[PDB]
Amino acid sequence: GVDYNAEIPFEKKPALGFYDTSEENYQAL
Amino acid sequence: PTYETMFAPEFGPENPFRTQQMAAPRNMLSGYAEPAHINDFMFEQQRRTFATYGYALDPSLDNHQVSAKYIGSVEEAEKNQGLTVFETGQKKTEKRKKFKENDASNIDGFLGPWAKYVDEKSEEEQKELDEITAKRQKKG
Amino acid sequence: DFPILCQTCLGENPYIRMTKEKYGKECKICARPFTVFRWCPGVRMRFKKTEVCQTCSKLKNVCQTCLLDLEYGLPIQVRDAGLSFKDDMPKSDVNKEYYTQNMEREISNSDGTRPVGMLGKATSTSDMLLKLARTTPYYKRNRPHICSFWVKGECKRGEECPYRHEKPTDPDDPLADQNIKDRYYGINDPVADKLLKRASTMPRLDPPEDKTITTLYVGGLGDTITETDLRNHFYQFGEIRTITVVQRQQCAFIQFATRQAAEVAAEKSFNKLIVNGRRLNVKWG
Amino acid sequence: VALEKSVSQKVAAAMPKLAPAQYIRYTPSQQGVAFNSGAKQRVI
Amino acid sequence: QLSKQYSSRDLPSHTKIKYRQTTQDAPEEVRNRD
Amino acid sequence: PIMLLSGHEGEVYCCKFHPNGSTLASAGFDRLILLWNVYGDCDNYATLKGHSGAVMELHYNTDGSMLFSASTDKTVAVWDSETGERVKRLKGHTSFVNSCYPARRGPQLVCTGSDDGTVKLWDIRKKAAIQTFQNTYQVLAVTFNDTSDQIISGGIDNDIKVWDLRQNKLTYTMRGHADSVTGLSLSSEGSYLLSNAMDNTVRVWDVRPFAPKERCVKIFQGNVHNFEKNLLRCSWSPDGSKIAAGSADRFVYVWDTTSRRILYKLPGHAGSINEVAFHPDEPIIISASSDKRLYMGEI
Amino acid sequence: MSEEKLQEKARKWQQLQAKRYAEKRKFGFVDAQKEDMPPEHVRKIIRDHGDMTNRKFRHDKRVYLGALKYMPHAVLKLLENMPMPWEQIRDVPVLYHITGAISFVNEIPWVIEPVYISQWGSMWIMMRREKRDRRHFKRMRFPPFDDEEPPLDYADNILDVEPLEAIQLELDPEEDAPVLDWFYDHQPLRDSRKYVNGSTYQRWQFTLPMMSTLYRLANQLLTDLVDDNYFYLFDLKAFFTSKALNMAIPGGPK
Amino acid sequence: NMLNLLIHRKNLNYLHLDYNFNLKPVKTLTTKERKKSRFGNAFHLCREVLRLTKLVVDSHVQYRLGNVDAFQLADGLQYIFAHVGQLTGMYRYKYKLMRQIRMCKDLKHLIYYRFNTGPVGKGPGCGFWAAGWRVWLFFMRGITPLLERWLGNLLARQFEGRHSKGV
Amino acid sequence: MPKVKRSRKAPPDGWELIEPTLDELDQKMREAETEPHEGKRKVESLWPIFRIHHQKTRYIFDLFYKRKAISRELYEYCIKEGYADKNLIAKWKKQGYENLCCLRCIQTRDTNFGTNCICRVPKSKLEVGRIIECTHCGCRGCS
Ligand SMILES: O=P(O)(O)O[C@H]1[C@H](OP(=O)(O)O)[C@@H](OP(=O)(O)O)[C@H](OP(=O)(O)O)[C@@H](OP(=O)(O)O)[C@H]1OP(=O)(O)O
Ligand SMILES: [Zn+2]
Ligand SMILES: [Zn+2]
Ligand SMILES: [Zn+2]
Ligand SMILES: [Zn+2]
Ligand SMILES: [Zn+2]
Ligand SMILES: [Zn+2]
């Protein structure tokens, strides 16, 4: 039941490539 | 493969790149581990020696690359001269008695090696515990 | 074969007898069967046994029984508050199963000795946690559990009772509850929070009493030291403005080009730096 | 040879005894001289 | 994670391998033949 | 190549090379003595059976026809290297025989030491002890000079003792070990005697009619003893140029008999090393250890 | 170094060597045997666990269940050791898991062939006489107990009670004397270095007097045909032929 | 105990196993209960073999209690082994068993004929089991490995899980 | 009433005088089988049996070997009737074993590590006065 709404079902953090993804974050709704 | 070639020190600078832990040689994350073939009997001798008295000769290979040293609390080791558990102690002390009847002719009577140490058969505490219990009950 | 362990668990004896079961228990995290190890740590000790499978340790870099970091002996929530939360790992059910599977292959392909991605991060440290890291083994942790007959007043094994006879911990204290899964993921961990509150009080970084001031009021100098110790320590930072020296109260004032550098020298320094085998203590003004 | 080893393990099911005592020598990664009694190694 | 389940079919049978013999038509003959 | 030998089920305590360099002999805690081909595929042939105690020390006579074996069962056996048949049992000591040596050149002689504190001279033809030297402390290692006149004994008294066969007196005492001596061996020239001891000191001593009078000719270092308290043995190279001694730290140490520099520190062993031997013609080392395996290092 | 210290050193060395090279620790030592235990131990274990419904027991419930796999094995060993009708009480060796889960009967019923035959020949006689003589031979009722009646503790009823006479037979003191002293014992001549091999109870060797006595005892169960001619086309060869040709010999098998 | 633990393990609280190993149901069953409660041949075979041994052992027990007599006990034993098909039900689950049943019927004819030869009549009392007893032992010798394999699988499914795959 | 003696022969001549104590010990044994399993834990549920058994066999062992008041006939009758224990008595004749509890405590296999239980280990070696109860047997220091 909580494999959906609690915790991201299965997570693949994107692989990281020659550039900086550290800074990026996103806005709420 | 000569000593000159095998043991020549790795050249020059050391990179701080590695944490105290990262700098250590390893086989399995937590450290380096490998086979050994130690005479079982000697193992028992050292294990009991340490367990009972606190001092046992240390096993190491490369501690100095030569070793002169015991690895125990060592208060016992200087005093007891490395008494082995198997080897008889130089001196004996402080025996405690357990009542025994061994004939077995008697019934109920008889105690064998089932002899309950004669010597060993708080109210203040008797209260704190009770209080705790009460608290627990309340919480339920 | 062979567990992954704290030095604190493994024991204070160097000689140790340790037994092994092929598939002993499920791990309480990824929930798989795994080789389990028991051993006796010491004379009055409890027979500890590994609680989690070796993989999810390599994953979060921790002892199998304690779940405390290898280097720091700190609960995971702490060292994440110390560096990087963004490791993550799915908590949720079938994900957890899936991510564990894949990461188990990824680990299989590593040199073997390295906690996966975290280790790329794990080198850069010392911010605080080194200063809150524990120093010596802590053996009070392996003591046998509290006898629960006696804690009701009855225990009839007398002195033989291997358990421990003493007052338990008041269930009031939030530090009691302590789930395992919880301690693993770094959620609302009471211990970890306590250590966080302890972290804050460290007199250290706020500084900035006055603007632009690079003046360093250095207490506990000592009359063995020279200035050249100072300079050859502090040229790392930048362009010094000057250094004032007083040996009558053994306090040394310092001045740098920018206040930033002075903050730095505080940080790097405070309750950390020692040279001439003698502690060099620092303050503002 | 490698295949045969593998096969025997599979076949272990079909045919439902181990007696080795094996010692190992361990280097920790914590060290520090107060961590053990004071040994760079332990034996298990 | 290997299950202790079994099945009838699976059990040993024909554990020996019948190698071809010389008059059956071993490869040795075949190589030489025109 | 290195070559790895395996087969002994228990700790190997000693190994030797046949005088002609064609075969090896090895034995230990199992109680079996194994013979090996030095060349070919390093095959194992005869197993000598008949020791009830563990084999503490092997030697070949100078001819390589007789193999001597001190066992913990208080018996020293004489073996036929050709057939593997037992020849004689020297029953005599009241306790464990720790070590034995056979006199080269002269009419057949054998010396032993044991935990009863005595050293005995045996004529293999008499079935009885010839002379007895009561020491007072348990005796661990014993060797003859090339003239077969003197007996050199190493015990737990930190003092190597030299005995005169004619006078039956304590002729010589050597001081310079701080602890028990576990292994002795003469140079092929008769000139020098090599010793191992708990104190982790390898010491060469020179024995001559005309002696400096404080014969601590040289001292070497590297060799570690530990809680196993295994007997440790050392050997001279065929030409007296190299010194090997086993240690408990898994390394075979080989030194330069002159400069005293460590030529080799060799690994591959998992446990403590009990004996190191040199092939009589070629620079080959047989290293025997408690990990039940042997290596044939080539230099 | 002092005399005192040397003596001390020597002492410790002696003890160390004595233990490290002790005979028992001798290379291929194999030590002891699983010495058997007091019978009351197993009795009490099962009685404690009699229904593993106790809250305390818990973990046996999984273990006990697991055994089911070897239960048929246990049954076969039980049944093959039934006591025979001339024995009152047969005692058997048993291996019981330290848990009480399962008892196996660890034994094979070996018998001396001519003795065995004789004894059942005796039983043939006895049973036939008994049937002749009793006015009304009452027979047992099946199951001998109700479903709702739980199984008996051996120790509570059976253990105490007498065994009640077996079938036996009245062997003549005179003619049957050779056989007569041990005829109805369990494994007749187990303790005799003259008659049997020993406690493995293989290879018997008797005198001709014993053989003749046994033969005579056995007569009711025995064929009176001394030649092989009776069985001419009633032997196996004929049956094989008969099979193959799809024929029957008048009173033989189809 | 084994069989009750199996029953409980699956929470089949509406079944009842009595002491002579008859598996009954407590109440009239619902459809769903009927599905779930079926046992396969493995369980039933085991149950019936146990029933046979309980018959045997009980017979001896009554002899020891002094309720019976030696001769009566012997006769009972012969009865048991000759009549397995009508005391047990083993066949239900394995029909091959009929092969043993027929053997026992034949040997009972044979022995009974010879035994009841003269004065002795058609009456109940003939003990002479040895034959019948043999037959069940041969049966058991073979069936044992079968039940080990089948009960093994039963246990393994119970504990490991039905391997869910359409395999 | 008795053990329901197996042999059917009459007991040997020496029986009458050792009858009572065997009767009383066995009565004690029956009591021990009966007593039940409350707060007794479990491994402590079996102890009185081993203890009584040790008592019985010690009795007949004393009478025969020490006081010499029994003929081998009666001695072996008490063995083969299962009053006394063969193996155990065969231990107590050994040099070291003379106070042994059980044949479990000296079984090597039964430990995790193939060693004899602390049950055996002489008091002088433990050297603490620490208190010990063998989980098998219920011994405290056999030796
Ligand atoms: O004479 P009994 O001792 O009582 O034996 C009877 C009887 O044998 P006879 O009739 O040959 O004397 C039955 O024969 P039928 O009545 O069937 O002709 C036989 O039956 P089977 O032919 O099936 O053997 C029956 O057994 P059952 O009662 O099961 O049929 C068996 O007595 P038991 O029941 O004592 O075997
Ligand atoms: Zn896990
Ligand atoms: Zn831990
Ligand atoms: Zn308590
Ligand atoms: Zn005991
Ligand atoms: Zn014990
Ligand atoms: Zn004991």
Q: Ligand 3 centre from C73 Cα, in Å?
A: 8
Question: Residue C125's closest chain B neighbor by CA?
Answer: B19
Chain F hits for G9, Cβ within 8 Å: 137, 156, 180
- For residue F172, the number of C-alpha atoms closer than 13 Å in the C-beta half-sphere is 24
Side chain identity, residue F152: I
Which residue of chain D has the CA closest to B35? Answer: D24
Query: Which runs of consecutive H residues, i.e. helices, occur in chain E?
Result: 27-32
* CA end-to-end span of chain A: 24
Tokens at residue G152, please? 């008996």
Q: Are strands F202-206 and F192-197 parallel, antiparallel or unpaired?
A: antiparallel
- Using the 8-state DSSP alphabet, how is residue G219 labeled? G
Regarding the beta carbon of H121 and ligand 1, being less than 6 Å apart is answered: no
Taken in order C94, C99, C105, C107, the sign of the CA dihedral is: negative
CB atoms < 10 A from the CB of H19, how many? 15
Topology annotation, domain F1-299? Methylamine Dehydrogenase; Chain H (2.130.10)
DSSP, residue by residue, H4-52:
HHHHHHTT-TTEEE-TT--EEESSPPPHHHHHHH---HHHHHHHHHHHH
Q: Is residue F214 packed enough to be buried (19+ CB in 10 Å), middle (13-18) or exposed (0-12)?
A: exposed
Element spanning C198, H or E: helix C190-201
For H71, residues 6+ apart whose C-beta sits below 8 A from its C-beta are: G126, G127, G130, G137, G167, H125, H127
The number of C-alpha atoms within 13 Å of C143 and in the hemisphere containing its C-beta is 11
Three-state DSSP state, F121: strand
DSSP for residue G68: G
DSSP class per residue in G95-139: EE-TTSS-EEE-------HHHHHHHHHHHHHHHHHHHHH-SS---
Q: Which residues, in sequence order, are bridge partners of residue F68?
A: F59, F78
**Residue-by-residue DSSP string for B71-88:** -S--HHHHHHTT--SSSP
Of F249, F262, F290, the CB nearest to B39: F290
What CA–CA distance (Å, rounded) separates C51 from C28?
A: 7
By the 8 A CB rule, do F225 and F176 touch? no
Q: How many helices (H) and strands (E) does chain I have?
A: 5, 0
Question: At which residue do the structure tokens 């005391």 appear?
Answer: H87
Contact of H163 with chain E, judged by CB distance below 8 Å, is answered with yes
Beta strands G103-105; G94-96: pairing state: antiparallel
Could you tell me how many helices (H) and strands (E) chain H has, helices first? 8, 2
Residues 45-84 of chain B with CB under 8 A from chain G are 45, 81-84
Compute φ and ψ for F113, nearest 5 degrees: -135, 150
**Amino acid in the structure at residue I108:** T
DSSP one-letter code for C109: T
Which residues have a beta carbon within 5 Å of ligand 7, which is an ion?
Answer: I 101, 105, 119, 134, 139, 142
Choose among F32, F35, F31, F29: nearest CA to F83: F35
Q: What are the chain F neighbours of B61 within 8 Å (beta carbons)?
A: 224, 249-251
Q: Which chains touch B (3 or more CB pairs under 8 A)?
A: C, D, F, G, I
Residue type, F189: E
Q: How far apart are CA G63 and CA G60, in angstroms?
A: 5
Indicate yes or no: CB of F227 within 8 angstroms of CB of B68: no
| Nearest partner of C87 among C79, D37, C95, G5, judged by Cα | C79
Specify whether the CB–CB gap between F280 and F19 falls below 8 A.
Answer: yes
Count of residues making up chain F? 299
Helix and strand element counts for chain D (H, E)? 1, 2
Q: Which atom of ligand 1 is nearest to the CA of H125?
A: 3
CA of C36 to the centre of ligand 3 (A): 13
C-alpha H80/C-alpha H68 separation (Å) is 15
Q: Does E6 touch chain D (CB under 8 A)?
A: yes
**What's the Cα-to-Cα distance from B33 to each of B25, B58, B67, C4, F291, rounded to whole Å?**
10, 17, 20, 11, 16
Pick from F138, F136, F169: nearest CA to F151 = F169
Question: What CA dihedral angle connects I77, I78, I83 and I89, to 10 degrees?
Answer: -120
Smallest Cα–Cα separation from G117: which of G219, G212, G218? G218
Greatest Cα pair distance, chain F, in angstroms, is 51
Q: What are phi and psi of F276, to 5 degrees?
A: -125, 130
How many CA atoms does the CB half-sphere of I59 hold within 13 Å?
Answer: 27
Name the strand (E) or helix (H) holding F294.
strand F293-298
**Contact between residue I4 and residue G160 where contact means Cβ atoms under 8 Å apart:** yes
What CA–CA distance (Å, rounded) separates G71 from G94?
Answer: 14
Distance CA A19, CA A27 (A): 21
Handedness of CA C256, C258, C261, C266 (dihedral sign): positive
Q: Which chain D residues are closer than 8 Å to B21 by Cβ?
A: 29-30
Cα–Cα distance between C263 and C206 in angstroms, integer? 9
Which residue is associated with the tokens 């020549």?
B8
The answer to whether the beta carbons of residues F33 and F69 sit under 8 Å apart is yes
Interatomic CA distance for residues G93 and G78, integer angstroms? 11
The answer to whether the CB of F219 falls within 8 A of the CB of F202 is yes
Each domain of chain I, given as residue ranges in start order, spans 1-143
Asked whether the beta carbons of B49 and B84 are under 8 A apart, the reply is: yes
Q: How many CB atoms lie within 10 A of CB I88?
A: 21
Other CB atoms within a 10 A radius of the CB of residue B24 amount to: 17
Please say whether the beta carbons of C222 and C278 come within 8 A: yes
- Best CA proximity match to G73, nearest among G104, G109, G110: G104
Which of B85, B104, B108 minimises the CB distance to I62? B104
Please name the residues in contact with H57: beta carbons below 8 A apart, sequence gap of 6 or more.
Answer: none
Instruction: Report how far residue C244's alpha carbon sits from residue C259's, in angstroms, rounded to the nearest whole number.
Output: 16
Q: How many residues would you count in chain B?
A: 140
The amino acid present at F195, given as its one-letter code, is S
Helix H70-82 / helix H41-64 crossing angle, nearest 10 deg: 170
Q: How far is the CA of G34 from the centre of ligand 5 (A)?
A: 15
Residues C93, F176: Cα–Cα separation, whole Å:
71
Q: What residues pack around ion ligand 2 (CB closer than 5 A)?
A: C 27, 29-30, 53, 56
Could you tell me how many helices (H) and strands (E) chain E has, helices first? 1, 0
Largest CA distance in chain D: 51
Tokens found for residue F21 = 């360099």
Instruction: List the domain boundaries for chain F.
Output: 1-299
Number of the ligand 1 atom closest to the C-alpha atom of G139 = 35
- Cα C170 from Cα G241, distance rounded (Å): 93
Resolution in A: 5.1
**DSSP H or E run through F209:** none
Q: Which residue has the tokens 């795959």?
A: H165
Instruction: Give the distance (Å) from ligand 7 centre to CA of residue I118.
Output: 8
Report residue G70 CA to chain centroid gap: 19
Residues in chain B within 8 Å Cβ distance of I128: 52
What is residue I128's DSSP assignment? S
Alpha-carbon distance of H7 to H26, in angstroms, equals: 13
- The dihedral sign for the CA sequence B53, B54, B59, B65: negative
Q: What is the CATH number of domain C215-284?
A: 3.30.70.330
Is the CB of H156 inside 8 Å of chain G's CB atoms?
no
Angle of CA points G22, G27, G33, to nearest 5°: 85
Residue with tokens 């503490």: F56
Cα Rg of chain A, angstroms: 13
* Cα distances (Å, whole numbers) of residue G135 to E15, F4, H118, H121, H125: 64, 88, 16, 12, 11
**How far is ligand 7, taken at its centre, from the CA of residue I44, in Å?**
14
- Say which residue the tokens 């032929």 belong to: G241
How far apart, in Å, are the Cα atoms of C80 and each of C99, C122, C128, C183, C189?
20, 10, 12, 12, 12
- Write down the residue that tokens 């043995």 correspond to: F233
Closest approach of chain H CAs to the CA of E16, in angstroms? 23
Instruction: Cite the DSSP H helix spans in chain I.
Output: 15-34, 47-61, 72-80, 86-92, 123-126
Q: Residue F208, by phi and psi: left (phi above 0), alpha (psi -120 to 50) or beta?
A: beta
CB contact at 8 A, C14 and C137: no
8 Å CB contact between I96 and I143: yes
At G203, phi and psi to the nearest 5? 55, 85
Cβ atoms of H134 and H107 within 8 Å: the answer is no
Contact F119, F163 (CB under 8 A): yes
Contact C99 A11 (CB under 8 A): yes
In angstroms, the CA I56 to CA I3 distance is: 14
With b for 16 or more beta-carbon neighbours within 10 A and e for fewer, the F241-256 pattern comes to ebbbbbbbbbbbbbbe
Q: Which residue has the tokens 């019976």?
A: H68
Contact C144, C163 (CB under 8 A): yes
Residues 6+ apart with CB under 8 A from H121: G131
**H123 Cβ inside 6 Å of ligand 1:** yes
Q: Do the Cβ atoms of D39 and B59 come closer than 8 Å? A: yes
Structure tokens at A2: 């909580």
The Cα–Cα gap between I70 and I88 comes to: 19
Two tokens, residue H38: 């079926």
Q: Strands C251-256 and C240-246: what pairing?
A: antiparallel
Strands (E), H21-157: 23-25
What is the C-alpha separation between C73 and C61, in angstroms, rounded? Answer: 11
- Identify the H or E element spanning G249: none
Per the listing, tokens 């708990």 go with F198
Residues ≥6 apart with Cβ < 8 Å to E31: none
Query: What are φ and ψ of residue C256, in 5° steps?
Result: -115, 160
Q: Which helix (H) or strand (E) holds F182?
A: strand F181-186
CA-to-CA separations, C82 to A23, C6, C127, C196, in angstroms, rounded: 18, 20, 7, 10
**CA distance to C205, C216, C265, I106, per residue, from C282 (Å):** 12, 7, 9, 68
Kindly state the tokens that stand for F257.
């008999």
Closest by alpha carbon to G71, among F161, I101, H47, B59?
Answer: H47
H/E run at residue C33: strand C33-39
Q: How far is CA G49 from CA C218, G40, G56, G95, I31, in A?
A: 77, 14, 10, 18, 18
**Which pair of structure tokens corresponds to residue B33?**
């581990």
CB proximity I87 to G under 8 Å:
yes
Q: G10 vs F96: CB contact, 8 Å cut-off?
A: no
Nearest residue to H93 (alpha-carbon basis) of H45, H49, H51: H45
- The DSSP result for chain B, as a single string, is --HHHHHPPPPS---TTS-TTTTS--SSSS-EEEEE---HHHHHHHHHHHHHHS--BPP-SSSSSS---B-S--HHHHHHTT--SSSPPSS--------------SSSS--SS----SS---TTHHHHHHHHHHHHHHH-
Residue environment code for C155-177, b if the CB has 16+ CB neighbours within 10 A, otherwise e: eeeeeeeebeeeebeeeeeeeee
Q: Are strands H23-25 and F218-220 parallel, antiparallel or unpaired?
A: unpaired
- Does the distance separating the beta carbons of F228 and B7 come in below 8 Å? no
Task: Take atom 1 of ligand 1 and give the residue whose Cα is closest.
Answer: H122
- Residue from I133, I128, I129, I130 nearest I117 by CA: I133
CB C263 within 8 A of CB C215: no
Q: Which residues of G touch F30 (CB under 8 A)?
A: 27
Say if residues G213 and G179 touch (Cβ distance below 8 Å). Answer: yes
C-alpha distance from F227 to closest chain B C-alpha (Å): 6
Distances (CA, A) of G134 to F133, G68, G138, H120: 94, 44, 9, 10
d(Cα G102, Cα G33) in Å, to the nearest integer?
Answer: 21
**Cα separation, C22 vs C24, whole angstroms:** 6
Query: What are the backbone angles phi and psi of residue G62, rounded to the nearest 5°?
Result: -70, -45
Residue with tokens 């003749």: G212
Residue type, I31: E
Strand order in the sheet with F23-28: F12-17, F23-28, F33-37, F44-48
Alpha-carbon distance C156 to C150, whole Å? 8
Element (H, E) at I98: none
- Cα G135 from Cα G131, distance rounded (Å): 8
Q: Taking every pair of C-alpha atoms in chain I, what is the biggest distance, in angstroms?
A: 54
I 24-83 residues with CB below 8 A of C?
A: 39
List Cα–Cα distances, F74 to C187, F12, F92, G10, G19, in angstroms.
69, 19, 7, 19, 15
Nearest residue to C57 (alpha-carbon basis) of C83, C22, C28: C28
Quick one: which H or E segment has residue F245? strand F242-245
- Give residue G67 CA to ligand 5 midpoint distance, Å: 29
DSSP string, C128-188: SHHHHS--S--GGGGPPPBPTTGGGT--TTGGG--SB-S----TTSTTS---HHHHHHTSS
